[PDB]
Amino acid sequence: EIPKPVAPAPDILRCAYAELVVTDLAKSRNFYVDVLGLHVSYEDENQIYLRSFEEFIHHNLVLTKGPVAALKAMAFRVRTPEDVDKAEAYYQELGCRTERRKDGFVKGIGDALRVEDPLGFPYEFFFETTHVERLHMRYDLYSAGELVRLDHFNQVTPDVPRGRKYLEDLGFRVTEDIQDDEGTTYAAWMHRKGTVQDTALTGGNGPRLHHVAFSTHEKHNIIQICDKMGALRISDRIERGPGRHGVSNAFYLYILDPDNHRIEIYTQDYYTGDPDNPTITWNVHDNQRRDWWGNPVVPSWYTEASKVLDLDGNVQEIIERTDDSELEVTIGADGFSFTRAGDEDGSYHGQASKGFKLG
């Protein structure tokens, strides 16, 4: 268990950006700029800094050339400069490795703290950032698939309750989760900014980064991303979807960048800012929990995720999940799922929905 520090948690506003290590910067640029239409805040031969349509901070995504594709940092903005000091004292009390840079780790960020957190993830906390032109009314630039906000991160970790408790002490509030009747937790979603999630935990071998999620305005914008990928003959890089989520109620799509980093496109979840916001727990065997329409969850969604780096830039050792596997209990040979709880009609045993088994 991870103890609650005496020191106050930093006041976290929201997820703000991710730094991803990529192996071929030009191929990654093609994906994020030419395919997905993100906006360049800065670039050179080593890095590309990208932002969404409605953003005013310097960036939502930094692509950094390196030898091994991995998550380098997932960054949260905090409310005040003093909250960076609070973050440092908090993670020091947790016994975590920290590194403080008064002029930032990446361009367009000022005083910043990076930590190897108790779950092995590289978190950054910062307040100071260079403001840029907010493009929210630049409809002369608007793409049919425009990505308008950074919405959330999702992390793979082996013990979800342990991670959940730690994030709760850090001020995140749980909105939704997936459990079974004999007390296993498979996933949890948690927020600071008044949407369903700023980060989320997926049970599995970790630390690994499951995905980074961007929003669109409308569902048709997500459809267009799929259509464009078909036209570019890269439909093999559409991993899963499009769909409606059960958990979060958002319309969604998962796609894979050139290094296999997973990107979710997302829209139209609900407001969670009231302190008594009702939590929702789904049963793991409910075949509408992940895709509301009952479409099968592609197996790579459960098995594949990105490496994460420590503060020296080396890959973090993976620790194996010992709790039950969501894949195995739902779509594996001994798994099952239901459409209506207790009804054999519309249930699936030893395979996925819609007539498929695992390949």
Identify which of residues 22 and 213 has a Cβ nearer to Fe ion in the complex: 213
Please pick, from the candidates 149, 191, 290, 321, the single residue that binds Cl ion as defined by CB under 5 A.
290
* Window 205-264: residues binding Fe ion (CB under 5 A): 213, 264
Q: Which residue has the tokens 């906000």?
A: 149
Q: Which among 18-26, 98-106, 256-264, 273-281 is the span making contact with a second copy, rule CB under 8 A? A: 273-281
Q: Which does 181 bind (CB under 5 to 8 A by kind): Cl ion, Fe ion, Ca ion, none?
A: Ca ion
CA separation for the pair 40, 32 (Å, rounded):
10
* Window 78-97: residues binding a second copy (CB under 8 A): 79-80
Residue 333 CB-density burial (10 A; 0-12 exposed, 13-18 middle, 19+ buried): exposed
Torsion of CA 221, 223, 228, 231, to 10 degrees: -160
For residues 341 and 283, the answer to whether their CB atoms sit within 8 Å is: yes
Q: Which among 75-83, 85-93, 95-103, 198-206 is the span making contact with a second copy, rule CB under 8 A? A: 75-83
Which phi and psi (to 5°) does residue 286 adopt?
A: -75, 110
Identify which of residues 51 and 118 has a Cβ nearer to a second copy in the complex: 51
Q: Which of 57, 252, 23 is nearest to 154 (CA)?
A: 252
131 is in an annotated binding site: no
Identify which of residues 245 and 285 has a Cβ nearer to Fe ion in the complex: 245
CA separation for the pair 42, 3 (Å, rounded):
40
Identify which of residues 162 and 237 has a Cβ nearer to a second copy in the complex: 237
Q: Which of 118, 123, 120 is nearest to 93 (CA)?
A: 118
Least CB distance from residue 78 to a second copy, whole Å? 10
24 is in an annotated binding site: no
Please pick, from the candidates 45, 140, 181, 182, the single residue that binds a second copy as defined by CB under 8 A.
140
Identify which of residues 28 and 330 has a Cβ nearer to Cl ion in the complex: 330
Which phi and psi (to 5°) does residue 34 adopt?
A: -75, -40
Least CB distance from residue 330 to Ca ion, whole Å? 11
For residues 188 and 200, the answer to whether their CB atoms sit within 8 Å is: yes
Identify which of residues 128 and 180 has a Cβ nearer to Ca ion in the complex: 180
Least CB distance from residue 274 to Ca ion, whole Å? 32
Least CB distance from residue 185 to Ca ion, whole Å? 13
Please pick, from the candidates 52, 98, 129, 154, the single residue that binds Fe ion as defined by CB under 5 A.
154
For residues 59 and 100, the answer to whether their CB atoms sit within 8 Å is: no
Q: Which does 290 bind (CB under 5 to 8 A by kind): Cl ion, a second copy, Fe ion, none?
A: Cl ion
- Name the H helices within 70-159: 82-93
